[PDB]
Design a protein around this ligand. Sequence first.
Ligand SMILES: [Cl-]
Lengths: 290, 296
Amino acid sequence: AQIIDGKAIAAAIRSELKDKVAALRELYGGRVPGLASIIVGQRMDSKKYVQLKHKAAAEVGMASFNVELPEDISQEVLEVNVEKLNNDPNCHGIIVQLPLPKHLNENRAIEKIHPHKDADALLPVNVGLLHYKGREPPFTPCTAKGVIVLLKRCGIEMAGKRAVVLGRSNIVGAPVAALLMKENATVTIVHSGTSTEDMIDYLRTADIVIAAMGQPGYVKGEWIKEGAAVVDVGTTPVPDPSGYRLVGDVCFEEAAARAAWISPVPGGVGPMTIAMLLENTLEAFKAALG
Amino acid sequence: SAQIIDGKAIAAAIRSELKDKVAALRELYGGRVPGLASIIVGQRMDSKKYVQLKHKAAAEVGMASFNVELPEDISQEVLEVNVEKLNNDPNCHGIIVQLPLPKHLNENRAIEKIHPHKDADALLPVNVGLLHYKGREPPFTPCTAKGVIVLLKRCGIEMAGKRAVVLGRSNIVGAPVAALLMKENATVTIVHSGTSTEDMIDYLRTADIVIAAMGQPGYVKGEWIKEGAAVVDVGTTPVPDPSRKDGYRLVGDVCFEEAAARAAWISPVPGGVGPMTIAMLLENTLEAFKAALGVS
Ligand SMILES: [Cl-]
């Protein structure tokens, strides 16, 4: 199996964005793209991703606006802070770090984000534009965009191929399936309603497999078609060593013995999703002054 | 042999149910009633006929009807103004623009003017988004798409835990119905122009449900259908075979008589969708009126 090096590929894209952003700074005053990120409650998991997200933003020479709010916050306040970032012309990309507190309604908060700034592509209007044939959205969900880029960059054919997507999530599973189809892959989406032996039968002939269920060590190598490509989007924290570890959905050592390609975890689609968020933001800024 | 999914009858039953529901809401809410509004531009006899049929169905159920007929050579701006008038008309709950418009007008732009909550055909991206958004329900589902799922539910055809193949990925039927089946927990594969014939056949071999939406007359062979499967033929294409007035008959994607020997359930063309689509347009419009009042 060929290790799909997302860390390397993303490193290449990050530099391409830095040099692109540098050029635009010369052409348009002291202006640079802005990446905002609201966080409700001091959640340990989400705090880490935010630190990594603004690091790459700083590494590519973008502005970062990290809003943090406490746990016991009313919806009105959360929606005011989003509208603040909407009216801020120095902020071009807005994301709300899920998962929010149970008492807060995520849907109605995300709805407040302007369509031209919805950098994570979570607004229904952006989800629709994606799925609608003959219409292309302002943004694509980062993880799904990344998976396709790793597919193209590695020279992996999607036209006329059989594709199984494990998971139907709004962030990864659904959008990747829609995009794989847009590349003339014949896609089947597996999920909790699917029986295990159905899953395995779909996997039996799958040329491309996307593990986006988010359950560590679920996909075994025996299911993967010999000569297929497997993208492990799963990235759940396990507390085994030292003080945490990032294990994915695919049983790597099993799947590597059969698949022609395999994305590892860590160092797979994780750095891609960050790169795509920046590229989205960069494209967001380029739209504002195109 | 396979049993015949009588879509015509099912739709008839639904129109009766809507009629009663609309009559029940009248008593409770001051004699108020749902309004289905349409906009047609120019004078195409195809578009005029379609619009009559929808408005007649709306009359049978006791809904109000709003037909706006604009000239063929009218401005985009002026069309959109009339669309905005309907948006701000509380007597009107559903709004459809009859397609295709004249070439000089922009359709997607005229449709974008419609308020998301009055988009009876579910043509707006935001409604398409909500339809695909796992964990949210759209105010409207695409009519033909929704009526295919209701055909199944009403025949007692299980979707959850089943394998399904949607032949075709068209915006108007294929794509939406594929997501509705997944939402119903069927495991769905969408076959399309990029799909190999051998794979298409392989997928169909295990398909408990099959939705024929490619638009190719008589191409799904009966032997490809899994023994006991449910087949919904949504494709419709005229052919010059039959000695008849007009010299044609509508023929579906599926070879019916072949599919009947293997399938448990099937919907023939004619009998596939048709009055279901219009029925689903009325149900969509009821939900809008039900929503606009505050009733769940
Ligand atoms: Cl699921």
